[PDB]
Amino acid sequence: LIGKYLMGDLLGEGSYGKVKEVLDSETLCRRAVKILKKKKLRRIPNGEANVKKEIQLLRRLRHKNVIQLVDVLYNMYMVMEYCVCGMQEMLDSVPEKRFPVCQAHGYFCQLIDGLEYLHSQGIVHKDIKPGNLLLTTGGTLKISALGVAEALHPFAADDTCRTSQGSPAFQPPEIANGLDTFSGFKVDIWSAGVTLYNITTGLYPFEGKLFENIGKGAIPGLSDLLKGMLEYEPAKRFSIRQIRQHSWFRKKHPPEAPVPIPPTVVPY
Amino acid sequence: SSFLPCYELLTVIGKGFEDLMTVNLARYKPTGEYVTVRRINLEACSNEMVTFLQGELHVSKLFNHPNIVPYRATFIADNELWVVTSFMAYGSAKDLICTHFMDGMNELAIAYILQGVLKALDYIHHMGYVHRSVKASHILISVDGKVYLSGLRSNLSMISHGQRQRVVHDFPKYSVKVLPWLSPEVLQQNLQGYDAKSDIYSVGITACELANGHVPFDMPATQMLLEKLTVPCFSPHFHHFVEQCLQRNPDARPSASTLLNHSFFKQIKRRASEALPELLRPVTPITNFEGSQSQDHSGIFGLVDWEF
Amino acid sequence: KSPADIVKNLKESMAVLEKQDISDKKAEKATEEVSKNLVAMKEILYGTNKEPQTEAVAQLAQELYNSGLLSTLVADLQLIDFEGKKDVAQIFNNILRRQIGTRTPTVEYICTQQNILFMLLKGYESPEIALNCGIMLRECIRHEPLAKIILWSEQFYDFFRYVEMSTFDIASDAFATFKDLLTRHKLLSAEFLEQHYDRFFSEYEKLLHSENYVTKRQSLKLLGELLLDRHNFTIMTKYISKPENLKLMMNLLRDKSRNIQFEAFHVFKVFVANPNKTQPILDILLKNQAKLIEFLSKFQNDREDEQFNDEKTYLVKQIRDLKRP
Numbered sequence: 048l049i050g051k052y053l054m055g056d057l058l059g060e061g062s063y064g065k066v067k068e069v070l071d072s073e074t075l076c077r078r079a080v081k082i083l084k085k086k087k088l089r090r091i092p093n094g095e096a097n098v099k100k101e102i103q104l105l106r107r108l109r110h111k112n113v114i115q116l117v118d119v120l121y122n123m124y125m126v127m128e129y130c131v132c133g134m135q136e137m138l139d140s141v142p143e144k145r146f147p148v149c150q151a152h153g154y155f156c157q158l159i160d161g162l163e164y165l166h167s168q169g170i171v172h173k174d175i176k177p178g179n180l181l182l183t184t185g186g187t188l189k190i191s192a193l194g195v196a197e198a199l200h201p202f203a204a205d206d207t208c209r210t211s212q213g214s215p216a217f218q219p220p221e222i223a224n225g226l227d228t229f230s231g232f233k234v235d236i237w238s239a240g241v242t243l244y245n246i247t248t249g250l251y252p253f254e255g256k257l258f259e260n261i262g263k264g265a266i267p268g269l270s271d272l273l274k275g276m277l278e279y280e281p282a283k284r285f286s287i288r289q290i291r292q293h294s295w296f297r298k299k300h301p302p303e304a305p306v307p308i309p310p311t312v313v314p315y
Numbered sequence: 316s317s318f319l320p321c322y323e324l325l326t327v328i329g330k331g332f333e334d335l336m337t338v339n340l341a342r343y344k345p346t347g348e349y350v351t352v353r354r355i356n357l358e359a360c361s362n363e364m365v366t367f368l369q370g371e372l373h374v375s376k377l378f379n380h381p382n383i384v385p386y387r388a389t390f391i392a393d394n395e396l397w398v399v400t401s402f403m404a405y406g407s408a409k410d411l412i413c414t415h416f417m418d419g420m421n422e423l424a425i426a427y428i429l430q431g432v433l434k435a436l437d438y439i440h441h442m443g444y445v446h447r448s449v450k451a452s453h454i455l456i457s458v459d460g461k462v463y464l465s466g467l468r469s470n471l472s473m474i475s476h477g478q479r480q481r482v483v484h485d486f487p488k489y490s491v492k493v494l495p496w497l498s499p500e501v502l503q504q505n506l507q508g509y510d511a512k513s514d515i516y517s518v519g520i521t522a523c524e525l526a527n528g529h530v531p532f533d534m535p536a537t538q539m540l541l542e543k544l545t546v547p548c549f550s551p552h553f554h555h556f557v558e559q560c561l562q563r564n565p566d567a568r569p570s571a572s573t574l575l576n577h578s579f580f581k582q583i584k585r586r587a588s589e590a591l592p593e594l595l596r597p598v599t600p601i602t603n604f605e606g607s608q609s610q611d612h613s614g615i616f617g618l619v620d621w622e623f
Numbered sequence: 624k625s626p627a628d629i630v631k632n633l634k635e636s637m638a639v640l641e642k643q644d645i646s647d648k649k650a651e652k653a654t655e656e657v658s659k660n661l662v663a664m665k666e667i668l669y670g671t672n673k674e675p676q677t678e679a680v681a682q683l684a685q686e687l688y689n690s691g692l693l694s695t696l697v698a699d700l701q702l703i704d705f706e707g708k709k710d711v712a713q714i715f716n717n718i719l720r721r722q723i724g725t726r727t728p729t730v731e732y733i734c735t736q737q738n739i740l741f742m743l744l745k746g747y748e749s750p751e752i753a754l755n756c757g758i759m760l761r762e763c764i765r766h767e768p769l770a771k772i773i774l775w776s777e778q779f780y781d782f783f784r785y786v787e788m789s790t791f792d793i794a795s796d797a798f799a800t801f802k803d804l805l806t807r808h809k810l811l812s813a814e815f816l817e818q819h820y821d822r823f824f825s826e827y828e829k830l831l832h833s834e835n836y837v838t839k840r841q842s843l844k845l846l847g848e849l850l851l852d853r854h855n856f857t858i859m860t861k862y863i864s865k866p867e868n869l870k871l872m873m874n875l876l877r878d879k880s881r882n883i884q885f886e887a888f889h890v891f892k893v894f895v896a897n898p899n900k901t902q903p904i905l906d907i908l909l910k911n912q913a914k915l916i917e918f919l920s921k922f923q924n925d926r927e928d929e930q931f932n933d934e935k936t937y938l939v940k941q942i943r944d945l946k947r948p
């Protein structure tokens with residue numbers, strides 16, 4: 048028990064904390080709690096600050112495709128809406144390590160919806176990747192882990208940015224070089240392009256050490272759409288409008304068996 | 316039958332929606348007709364709550380059926396939302412239980428009540444909705460036997476993306492009170508989700524509530540979840556009818572339309588209109604609203620400087 | 624009986640109901656024929672429980688386009704029975720979402736027959752069809768080219784009346800369509816708000832003064848959301864530069880209602896956070912500096928929210944640090 052929440056089994060454990068399932072004891076709503084060891088945060092550089100920051104953002108954000116923050120409790124515990132699985136977990140469950148085009152496409156349009164929303168709030172996510180994209184039981188994609196996101200100023204003219212701190216593989220060539228100021232949105236787009244590249248093929252567009260390889264700018268075999276998202280020049284790189292209007296996005300692909308989602312409260 | 320936003324408010328006849336809603340008997344001053352006015356201080360609702368309430372109105376204007384309470388008018392007065400509906404003089408079936416039939420109702424009376432409910436659910440299930448609040452407090456008996464299903468607020472549509480979904484996964488908001496009446500697969504919130512066959516589980520629950528006079532499972536909410544995940548419990552046919560409603564597997568629970576065909580409904584001869592007033596025998600409804608009897612403590616059911 | 628058969632009977636039977644004035648016998652048969660066929664259409668498009676037949680749907684769509692029946696069913700929705708009107712909308716909603724390759728054929732159809740959109744719009748004025756007109760318009764406006772046609776039209780401004788309708792069911796429906804048009808297609812709504820600024824906000828201004836509590840509260844919430852969307856940057860900087868808008872926000876801070884004043888607080892913050900205030904905006908804030916500091920400090924001390932407490936704090940500091948260039 049914690050507030051009106053009683054605890055369940057481990058669902059996952061990223062870098063920051065262990066995530067356990069929870070159950071609202073008054074309403075009976077299935078929820079999830081991010082559990083953060085106060086002392087372990089203090090020794091993650093900017094760990095405390097990243098958390099308070101994410102809590103600030105999630106408190107003023109609301110969209111079908113952004114993860115919902117429900118409550119915050121102390122003594123630390125972030126109560127989140129429940130998701131049955133994260134994207135990377137599904138990829139990890141099948142030998143192929145990729146989705147059929149029809150499945151991947153739905154996820155990708157859901158992702159564009161969330162990104163468009165967040166950008167319109169001036170949020171630059173900075174860590175778009177399958178491990179950060181979760182799924183409800185109703186197959187709704189939720190962009191999660193706003194840990195390293197940069198809220199732009201409502202009076203900044205541009206989406207100009209300065210820091211990286213996203214996941215190394217999903218980083219663009221602007222960052223694999225320093226640069227000093229770059230469009231924040233176009234960083235999200237390269238990152239979307241690397242996740243789309245992945246969910247569709249099973250492979251990553253860059254190996255690694257890592258940064259030297261990205262800051263040099265190869266497709267396997269949609270292809271036009273992938274080059275556009277993964278442009279080395281941010282100017283020539285697709286805007287979210289250009290993604291929406293591209294024929295691969297607009298096409299309704301014929302739906303073959305998709306990855307079903309891989310195979311907690313009774314004792315308590 | 317037009318109405319204008321001018322209503323004499325009287326008796327509190329019920330409450331609801333987290334206690335934000337008062338239910339009033341009222342006199343429509345123009346015509347002299349007695350109706351129900353449902354009122355909610357919107358000042359006390361989140362923007363979301365208002366939207367949720369806005370959804371109930373839409374759905375009600377969509378539904379048209381003889382066992383569904385119709386809404387006659389909706390408008391803003393000052394900071395409150397008012398929904399005008401016909402007055403069901405007997406009250407709800409929860410009134411009748413709590414107020415007089417504390418140890419439960421007569422089996423024939425239950426046969427009519429459940430019949431009306433199944434007819435309405437057949438219609439809403441065919442319209443592509445799931446009710447999600449089937450319970451005795453949402454069953455109104457008219458001034459002359461006509462049974463109505465209410466509680467449209469909880470109605471979720473299964474038509475999504477202009478297509479019909481086999482299953483839904485939506486945990487209903489503002490549902491704390493309803494919890495006991497919800498199917499196991501509503502409550503467990505996993506990958507299978509639920510469908511129209513969840514309200515048939517609630518029919519079985521409502522069946523035990525009418526027959527017993529107390530809801531299945533007053534205990535805390537988590538305890539009834541542990542039990543749901545066992546089941547509650549007269550003519551042989553009725554027991555079996557209940558046993559069918561309450562089956563663990565939804566696919567084995569029969570629909571509203573084929574529930575209609577159960578042998579339990581064979582005992583129905585007259586129509587509920589020519590037999591139900593008689594079955595709620597000891598209880599006489601209220602006719603004379605021109606008296607102090609509407610201001611009696613009992614209620615009316617169960618009678619026997621900026622600088623610019 | 625085939626899709627072409629169903630469409631033909633439907634087209635014919637509707638012609639009958641439209642016909643000036645005829646025998647009662649034929650109106651009953653046609654009414655039945657309208658209901659019966661609409662049921663069969665819905666059931667082709669949605670299936671039963673037999674999923675939607677891929678091939679019959681193709682056929683039915685092509686017949687609908689050629690028959691003109693899609694335009695007819697909207698215009699003469701009043702002549703159709705209760706359950707049939709619901710079916711019209713359901714059918715409409717479904718063929719609308721039809722998609723072949725990169726093409727969306729029904730959007731293309733309507734683009735050649737745009738009076739369908741305006742007829743649906745005008746539906747808010749007939750109580751017996753407003754709801755189904757609303758349902759169909761909201762679906763239409765999911766599609767960018769259809770939203771554009773409405774936004775760019777003279778009759779768009781009728782929404783300003785439709786949302787002040789004394790029937791809350793229809794008023795709420797109309798405002799939901801209105802909110803949607805302004806917020807879904809983000810590049811379109813900025814284009815629209817740039818171009819039609821003066822007339823839009825002269826009408827919007829009116830809504831912030833509505834005697835309807837729900838109208839005021841909602842127009843204000845919506846204004847805050849518009850102003851903070853980055854796509855609307857240019858619109859914001861214009862809105863926050865006009866003294867009258869500042870006066871209005873400042874005056875709504877003192878309103879009867881805790882909820883309205885909170886919304887005004889959320890527009891008001893935008894005025895203050897501005898680095899590039901114009902002189903008269905600057906001036907009002909200066910004239911009221913001490914009063915603002917006293918006001919904001921006491922402002923709804925009855926929540927402990929935290930984010931809100933942080934917002935007041937940030938604003939008070941903003942106000943204190945005010946000077947002249």
Ligand SMILES: Nc1ncnc2c1ncn2[C@@H]1O[C@H](COP(=O)(O)OP(=O)(O)NP(=O)(O)O)[C@@H](O)[C@H]1O
Nearest residue numbers: 328329330331332338351400401402403406407452
């Ligand atoms: N038309 C009516 N005629 C007579 N009684 C009514 C009528 N409408 C409502 N009531 C009474 O008012 C009660 C509450 O109305 P209801 O529509 O059930 O609100 P609610 O929000 O669902 N309450 P709850 O069950 O706590 O969620 C009913 O159970 C009846 O007792």
